[PDB]
């Protein structure tokens, strides 16, 4: 409820006249425990997991003096993962232009 | 850096919806009724079994051993966008046919082989395989989220 | 009664009430810890709180806040606040 | 039993995913490039060395830093403008009293045959005398707000409004201002920058935009903002593009981008800062890049915040000389750091690594050819090149250029060596400095100094060079060849080439280029056509051979169609196993074979 | 039977001159004075140090460019502000990248206790953007051509418009312009310079504005050209004090200038070179100003255009420090020269030209003080003070200020010595330096070194100095005085000293001042009102007396009204004859004597 | 050009014709004279016969040059004469271009 | 240094004109008729002996032993410029009295002395004395110059 | 016909590899008239001025380095006389 439609954060305000239409789906890779992509991040190749903490962010932001190994949002997004294993390769490619947020879990 | 400028994904409310929704069963099963299977694409039909929203998914074997899965609402008030300028061409499709058939699944062949791709009914859910080796599964942990645009206010 | 006061550098021996008196006696400026007469002098700010500094005696009393504790103002007009945080 | 489990959550739109099967790493590349486009092929120049900072005073201080390249005998293609050159950061204008003669420098600098590197941001300043900000507020191209007024925010030129670039008539406006006619003082040896296209905005929220804007089409701003930048670089790169009349090929950096941006030119990481992990992560980010078909990658050379120390420059420029976009940029309180303003140790590091870049520019042309036609990324991670090496899988500290060149740069201050992973069960490896051979797979200990770049050839891969670094690239285009053969275990190598004339569509429109395959197996060295559509008028000749792991033959005959049979007189290094062919003197146009007897 | 024909021939108006008939050149000046009035008091700010070039880079240049000054200990009151602090050279703005919040830069200045000068010049960009352009266009306050439309030319903002400095409307609408309302940014620390009045045109002939222009009340350009940089010095003086409430004193620089523009502030010798030549010609061309009125004069210290070498830097600030206008400036394409960015030797000799300027801080005031009542030049040609000894009636490589300091640069590469003219019969002269007296008439051999600046020091003269150099003259103007008496040879000497609140009208308006008259004879030094009109709340102390020329005392006893007898302590040194009376305590307000017996 | 009259490319149209007005001054026992600044020269004046007077004509010379009489960006019309004897001074209130003539005798 | 962007006096042809004009025997004269002793100045009539131009002298003993001279024209055409905001305040004058008068000139004191100027009308000139030490002399060389609006 | 050696004592090679474009010195001396060598020079005779030389590499560089115009004979470039 709170926040699903006029949204403030800091000073600034989102009037956001057409309420929550958020949309999200996920994915499953047997086999694969190395992914990589989704730019722009100041982190390692091979993406980390995000269950403890922050999702990757993919919204084009001016960070004044960023920071290295976060997962804080820089300048460019990229929806495009790779997962590598020694047997196959295979890519995911979510063509939206909003912000996006983008989980990693292992199993 | 000043991190309080910059919102994480609690701050960020569609992402806290999103997150809230922890992995189990998932509410979204697809109406193998309203299947058709044309020669460029498969839709059929999709409902949330508490808010009764019904969803359209068109599902794509395209050449070079790709698949497409776009998922829209079935009559929206307004439409939702699309991105442009992105994709250079229109990607040629691959022909699906029905090669697997019960009450809760549906087996789909792309082309001839050796790709197929098998849709559950209910819970909703997608697998993709090369012959049968699973290749990777869509919404097989229940997370999939799809807030149909509300009436305003 | 009381004894007198000698520069460090041994330059010469003068009475008690000649050290802090505005006016510099020693070549090394030793007689004037606490104001700006002696043009070779030093200052020390204390500043508790934070890192403790010496600066010129020129910046005594010159208005500025040189120290963050703001000893160094004490009979200038300009208030210091402590800013040692 | 190991899974991975991605999720995306998006804030609109629909959901519209593309799964790319492989099943190889190739395969998705290609895949992925037959939806998104592939690597917008660079002028040559624009693989060269780019002089930058902000700010160059004048026209006086652009030519005195060109000067000095040359007077310290460091080659340069571009010197860059940044936003103090214009009037009040109105951009597409000049300041009247600092760049009074715009085309008298420019012609300078064509007349030293290097280039020049303006910045056009998409924020225009809020300012009735300005007519940029009277055409697009007049003519409705600004984005809106919902009470149908024009957005106004903050940025350099104080208060500003934000062109819609997401309309197609804003588009073709902004691609036609770039004419020769509309941009006074241009030229056609002046090229573009574009900076702050997320779009920044000072005073806004998360410093950008507001989520309720509202652009062509009536969608809001949180429908379009990822791609608004990837709209501000393609229209640039159009408008230099028809200001030639279709001839040229553009060049403009980007700092924000999306998906497809690869086909509009270069892109960069932004701010970082002078810092030895800053210079560390370099790679991987560039990596992340190229995976996604981003080929056009680099990061400012010795940091854009704060002043680094003489050693971290150094190691910055060999890091830099060996990634794509090659740059050195500074902010406007560093610290001048022109590469000779350093200590005559670190001036001659510096120019060393300045010049096996242009000396490999042969080999980079052609590899970026291969990633404009196929969708191959130039700069690779190891894992790429060898899928089956687990302990590949997270290397970041080193990568590979094409299949051909592997790179460890140093990184660390003070190091006295690196550790080098040279993967591959049957190959074998050459130190491109001692042509000493190493067998793979192992982790070699390479000692090193104050000069030293870690570079290694691969066995079975044949690498061009222009032997003859000049002052920019330009000065070399027409330079003879070198061929650097490295042997595998099974005697043979090959590699290709590509040339055309180095900044048009000739090569697309006329098929006026060369693609060249050279091959070696048994004592045979064969140069043969990969394309035969592609012709080209060019002096360009076979000036050497240079062949790591071979004997050392009893004599050496050269076969070209057209000709005689001829001899080549050679010397061998038994030590090395180094063969040195001179002077086979035959055009780069030509089929010809060498063989050693 | 010598004699001189002076013939003078004007374009247009009538004839009209003054003769003035003396006869002592002291009469002329009270006679000129008279006419066009007295040299405006400077605040006590202006005559300190100025850190000048074109340009300092932004608002954190600025304070680096403070701070460097505090952390090499060198004094200076005002860091200046060229034309590219403004919105791309549009006047009364300031840039929106390099500084965005000027208030918060001039507070950090005035918590150093300095002051900024920002440059405003006549000239206004044409610009419909432009909030001054289009005022003076819809008021009609621009200078016009004979067709009725409004001049344009060209100069630093490309094309621009000259307002009519000659219409008391346009004055009256220029200091308006002025108050902290109007000029955004502004604050009372900072203050104006007032460049290309001429007023410069590029394009103009001979770079100036054309004859047949058009001022108010129809007469022509040719009618008024002198005059018109004047009106702009007068017109922006009248602004500074206006802004205050008439309360604050002005200081303008400008660069042209005419008879009576002594009365609005400072002129200098606009843009010389960084050679020898023209540090020495800095000499007859302030005294030749200073004859004809104009004591606040001086030139660029260093040379404005190209780079002086290290020992010419040094030689330079030695012979400002004994200038009048003490400011160091340097054109665009010059290296940095703030005098910390020097090797340590000539650091030093440039922070002891700094520290005896300081310390002659009460001098300089009392003399500009009696230039403004008097209209006595403050730097004089030696001749002025000797009017009988022939042989000065030429010197121009040495002056003297008041009739207590002569001094002789040293203006000349890797000099050994200088040859130093000490006129006068039955006079003497102290080495300010040594304390070595020396009798007149001769011309005396000095050796010198890289310190050295050959000062000496009039005999019957008392000059009064704060000993305690502080980092700016605001730090200084309530510390104690030292007196420092020349002995005559009849063992006389005398002295004057002005006090004041160092930068308003108090003086003038409420007689809130003190002028002391210091008197030596037989053995006693007095302490009396030279004006009893004045009275003024102050600290101001006299800490020691310094005595050149005298015996030892057996004792030395100080009266003061108010006070008991009391004795002083004291030093001498018999090989120089010094004699050092420790710590008097009295106050400078109060009369006083001390007896020597 | 004593009406319409052009000087490089630039013209003047000079609507009143020729206006200019001149007067000549003795000095005698006189042999130094000073001031009429603003020039980069000595001093004390030097005479004119030979060469060029001494121009006053507020103009913005670029890289102005020493020992010459050239106008630079002021102009005070006043000239003081010196000798053993007394001193003098004229004071010539004209505000447009000015040029004075020195000789001696 | 290439100096042509600035005039010499042959290019300034007002500067050329009247710099032609050589030591001579000035044409002009003052008519002893139309001399007025005003409150504060004398004026008098010039003429011009070859083009019989008429101007007016405004000669003019100052306070503090300074003499001030104005030359206009008598019916100019229009009025010439007059250098206005650069005096402080209009100079005290002193009074001129007639101490010497014969056929060619006019002895003027200031005062009550010891400064006189004379007055010669025949070729037009101005002597200045203290007593009678001749301090300067004007229009001696004959160099006046005049150029009336056409 | 002699062969020629190289200033610094090290090889001889025929006449013909003299300006063969090709560099054959250790010095760069077998190249004077080309850009063949990393490390030769070349002289602007520069006739009836002042004389200089070059870097090898900038001979045939389509850049204007002597005023001359002798270090471009075969770029495209045509280099006019400028040595007043
Ligand atoms: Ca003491
Ligand atoms: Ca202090
Ligand atoms: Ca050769
Ligand atoms: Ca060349």
């Not at chain 4, 574009?194 to 998360?206: L, T």
């Not at chain 4, 969608?219 to 709209?231: A, V």
Request: proline share 7%.
């Amino acid at each position: 409820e709170p926040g699903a439609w006029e949204e403030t954060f800091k000073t600034h305000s989102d009037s956001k006249p057409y309420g929550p239409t958020s949309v999200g789906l996920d994915f499953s890779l047997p086999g694969m425990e190395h992914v990589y992509g989704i730019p722009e991040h100041a982190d390692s190749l091979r993406l980390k997991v995000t269950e403890g903490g922050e999702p990757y962010r993919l919204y084009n932001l001016d960070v004044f003096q960023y920071e290295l190994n976060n997962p804080m949002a820089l300048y460019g997004s990229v929806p495009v993962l790779l997962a590598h294993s020694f047997h196959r390769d295979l890519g995911i490619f979510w063509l939206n232009a909003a912000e996006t947020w983008v989980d990693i879990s292992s199993n | 850096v000043d991190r309080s400028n910059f919102k994480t994904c609690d701050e960020s409310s569609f992402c806290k919806r999103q997150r809230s929704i922890r992995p189990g069963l998932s509410p979204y099963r697809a109406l193998l009724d309203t299947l058709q299977l044309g020669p460029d694409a498969l839709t059929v039909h999709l409902i949330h079994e508490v808010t009764k929203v019904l969803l359209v998914l068109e599902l794509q074997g395209l050449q070079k051993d790709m698949t497409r899965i776009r998922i829209d609402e079935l009559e929206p008030r307004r439409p939702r966008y699309r991105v442009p300028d992105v994709l250079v061409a229109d990607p040629p499709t691959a022909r699906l046919s029905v090669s697997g058939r019960d009450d809760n699944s549906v087996e789909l062949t792309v082309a001839e082989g050796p790709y197929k791709i098998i849709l559950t009914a209910q819970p909703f859910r997608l697998d993709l395989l090369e012959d049968r080796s699973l290749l990777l599964s869509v919404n097989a942990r229940g997370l999939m989220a799809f807030e149909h645009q509300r009436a305003p206010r | 009664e009381s004894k007198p006061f000698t520069c460090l550098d041994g330059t010469a021996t003068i009475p008690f009430d000649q050290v802090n008196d505005d006016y510099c006696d020693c070549k090394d400026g030793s007689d004037e810890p606490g104001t700006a007469a002696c043009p070779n002098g030093s200052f020390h700010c204390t500043n508790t709180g934070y890192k403790p500094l010496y600066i010129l005696s020129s910046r005594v009393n010159d208005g500025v806040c040189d120290c963050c504790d703001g000893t160094d103002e004490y009979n200038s007009g300009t208030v210091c606040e402590n800013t040692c945080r | 039993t190991p899974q991975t489990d991605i999720r995306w959550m998006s804030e609109s739109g629909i959901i519209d995913v593309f799964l790319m099967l492989g099943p190889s790493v190739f395969d998705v590349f290609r895949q992925y490039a037959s939806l998104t486009g592939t690597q917008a092929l660079p002028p040559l120049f624009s693989l060269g060395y780019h002089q930058s900072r902000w700010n160059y005073r004048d026209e006086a201080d652009v030519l005195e830093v060109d000067q000095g390249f040359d007077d310290h005998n460091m080659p340069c293609d571009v010197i860059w403008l940044d936003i103090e050159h214009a009037d009040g950061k109105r951009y597409f204008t000049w300041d009247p009293t600092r760049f009074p003669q715009p085309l008298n420098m420019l012609e300078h600098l064509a007349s030293k045959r290097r280039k020049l590197v303006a910045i056009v941001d998409p924020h225009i300043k809020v300012d009735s005398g300005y007519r940029v900000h009277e055409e697009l507020r007049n003519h409705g191209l600004y984005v809106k707000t919902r009470d149908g007024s024009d957005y106004e925010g903050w940025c350099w030129p104080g208060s500003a409004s934000y062109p819609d670039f997401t309309n197609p008539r804003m588009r073709a406006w902004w691609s036609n201002m770039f004419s020769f006619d509309n941009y006074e003082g241009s030229a056609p040896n002046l090229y573009v920058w574009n900076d702050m296209n997320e779009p920044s905005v000072f005073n806004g929220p998360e410093v950008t935009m507001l989520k309720d804007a509202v652009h062509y089409g009536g969608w809001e701003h949180r429908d379009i903002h990822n791609i608004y930048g990837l709209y501000v670089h393609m229209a640039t790169a159009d408008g230099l593009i028809q200001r030639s009349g279709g001839i040229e090929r553009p060049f403009v950096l980007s700092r924000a981008f999306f998906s497809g941006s690869q086909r509009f030119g270069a892109v960069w990481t932004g701010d970082n800062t002078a810092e030895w992990d800053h210079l560390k992560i370099s790679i991987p980010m560039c990596l992340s890049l190229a995976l996604v078909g981003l080929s056009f990658c680099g990061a400012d050379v010795g940091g854009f915040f704060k002043n680094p120390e003489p050693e971290l420059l150094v190691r910055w420029y060999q890091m830099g000389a060996y990634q794509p976009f090659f740059r050195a940029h500074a902010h406007l309180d560093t610290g001048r750091r022109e590469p000779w303003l350093l200590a005559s140790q670190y001036q001659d590091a510096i120019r060393d690594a300045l010049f096996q870049r242009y000396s490999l520019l042969p080999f980079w042309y052609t590899l970026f050819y291969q990633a404009h036609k196929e969708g191959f990324p130039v700069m690779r991670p190891l894992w790429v090149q060898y899928p089956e090496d687990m302990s590949t899988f997270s290397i970041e500290d080193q990568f590979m250029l094409g299949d051909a060149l592997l790179i460890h740069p140093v990184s660390d201050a003070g190091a006295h060596g690196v550790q080098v992973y040279l993967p591959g069960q049957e190959e074998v490896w050459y130190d491109i400095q001692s042509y000493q051979k190493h067998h793979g797979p192992q982790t070699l200990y390479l000692p090193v100094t104050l000069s030293s770049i870690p570079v290694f050839q691969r066995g079975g891969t044949i690498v061009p060079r222009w032997m003859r670094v000049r002052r920019s690239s330009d000065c070399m285009k027409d330079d003879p060849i070198t061929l650097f053969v490295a042997l595998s275990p099974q005697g043979t190598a090959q590699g290709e080439l590509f040339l055309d004339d180095g900044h048009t569509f000739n090569y697309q429109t006329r098929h006026e280029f060369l693609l060249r395959r050279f091959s070696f197996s048994g004592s045979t060295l064969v140069s043969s056509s990969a394309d035969p559509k592609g012709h080209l008028e060019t002096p360009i000749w076979i000036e050497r051979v240079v062949i790591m792991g071979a004997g050392k033959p009893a004599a050496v005959v050269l076969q070209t169609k057209g000709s005689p049979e001829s001899r080549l007189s050679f010397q061998h290094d038994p030590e090395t196993s180094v063969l040195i062919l001179r002077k086979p003197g035959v055009s780069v146009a030509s089929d010809w074979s060498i063989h050693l007897r």
